[PDB]
């Protein structure tokens, strides 16, 4: 992985409990790497799941760090 | 989990404030102070003096 270039292209689905809290989170799709040409290429897969969550942690993660 | 994991456990610190006090002297109870002065003294010295 070392000074690769990563991208996260990621979907969410979360059905509900009340307004503030989800029953079940889900989020997914592939993890791509920049080439020397700058084409991406899948290398990975993003693949949390979850019941009761006050947030996706997932998109937290990469709204700090990407 | 939110902020009801993390908050129901960040505990509450107390700072001391200063309390000045006047330091007058511990009377110890009247058992122990006759074990200090001989037995004899008791009614021989005039307290006015």
């Given at each position: 992985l070392l000074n690769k270039t990563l991208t996260f292209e990621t979907e969410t689905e979360?059905?509900?409990?009340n307004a503030n809290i989800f029953s079940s989170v889900k989020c997914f799709?592939?993890?791509?790497?920049?080439?020397?040409?700058?084409?991406?290429?899948?290398?990975?897969?993003?693949d949390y799941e979850a019941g009761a969550s006050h947030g996706n942690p997932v998109v937290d993660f990469l709204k700090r760090n990407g | 989990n939110g902020?009801?994991?993390?908050?129901?456990?960040?505990?509450?610190?107390?700072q001391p404030r200063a309390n000045i006090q006047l330091?007058?002297?511990e009377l110890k109870p009247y058992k122990q102070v006759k074990q200090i002065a001989p037995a004899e003294l008791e009614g021989l010295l005039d307290l006015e003096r």
């Open positions: 979360v059905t509900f409990k799709g592939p993890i791509k790497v920049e080439l020397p040409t700058k084409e991406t290429v899948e290398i990975g897969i993003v | 902020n009801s994991a993390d908050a129901a456990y960040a505990q509450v610190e107390i330091d007058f002297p």
